[model samples]
Target: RLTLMEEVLLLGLKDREGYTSFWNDCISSGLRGCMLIELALRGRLQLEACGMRRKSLLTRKVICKSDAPTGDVLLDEALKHVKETQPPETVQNWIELLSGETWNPLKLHYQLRNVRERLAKNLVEKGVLTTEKQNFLLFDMTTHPLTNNNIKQRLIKKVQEAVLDKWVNDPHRMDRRLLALIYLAHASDVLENAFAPLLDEQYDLATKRVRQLLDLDPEVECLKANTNEVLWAVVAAFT
Candidate 1:
């Protein structure tokens, strides 16, 4: 299975350019959030206990449920950091720490460098992309263009059906990963790329439904059965 980071990157990148938008800056932070969610979904992490008084999602700290290595390098790195942390960090804090957005010089070591490139490389290894050397006016950069059209198309089709033909009015009724993907895709600001080619009415309807999902209360949603509080916490961080 493709990680959420790869899915978001696939959605964010241009098919031919093999890179995300130059002006679009949110995907980096978005990918960090995706990493956290992927860890949470894979049973490697979770939020700390809510006291009898019921702490808010933003205030709750993230805890490692298992120190097991996820085979994926990025996830394993984050897992190690989380497992070794003296005082666990919250969802928002982890996102910023992983993205290297913290102001503290001492904390800069938390940054995950070459994340996008590494994830692209993973995709390349998986046969979804092909490596290339591209020349920009001032420099030569490694780029990865799509090698398998069907792989990306299947992802697009899944996303499209989730919000369109297979629409569900209740968040609790939807598949966890699909719901998280829709939210994270929007958080990454790349959901548009998936919906870009939709018909006029379909696009409008899709946007409206996404707006509805965005407006839902993270606190309330986390209370449902089989729900992931960490996922909602990540959703709350971006929104």
Candidate 2:
């Protein structure tokens, strides 16, 4: 399965252009959020337990549950950092750090460089995209255009179904990863692209479902059974 970061990256990429829009600013931080959640989902990390008193999402630090390698270079690098830190950083701080948005010069090394390029390479290896250099008049830039339509089509379909026919009023009834994808895609600002081709009625319903997910309180949702606090913490950070 593609990691959450890869999935979100695939969603944001322009199929023909093989790249994300130059104007998008949210996807970088959004991808970082995906990485954090992916780690938690893989059992490598989690939010520090909320005591009986209940701590706010921002106050809870990200704790490493296991130091085992995830076999993905990016995830393992992030795992090492999380394991070595003196005090675990909060989900918000990690997102900023991973996106290279930190004010602390000392922490700048935590930044994950060439994330898009690396992820695109992974997609290329997976046969979903093909690498090419496009000359943009002044410069030639590498791009990964979609080579396999089925993968992205399936992804879009899954997203569409989650909001339309498969709609669940209770967020918990939905697949956890799918729930995360809906939230993170919106946070990344690329979700609209998936819904763009829908019929007028379908589009309205899909977006309405999205807004319902958005309207939910991450804090309240995190307290429910079978939910991941780290996932909610990332949602809270983005919201």
TM-score top scorer: 1
Cα TM-score of candidate 2: 0.93
lDDT of 1 by residue, 1-239 (tens): 79998998888765566544652558888888899999999898888885716688999999999999889989988888898876888888899888888789978888898887789789988899898887989999877788788888899989988889899787778888888899989998888888998999999999999999999999888888778889999999999
In model 2, state the lDDT of residue 9: 77
- Write the residue-wise lDDT of candidate 2 on 125-157 in tens digits: 789888787788899887777888888888989
Q: What is the lDDT of residue 10 in candidate 1?
A: 83
TM-score of each: 0.94, 0.93
Error of 2 at 169 (Å): 1.5
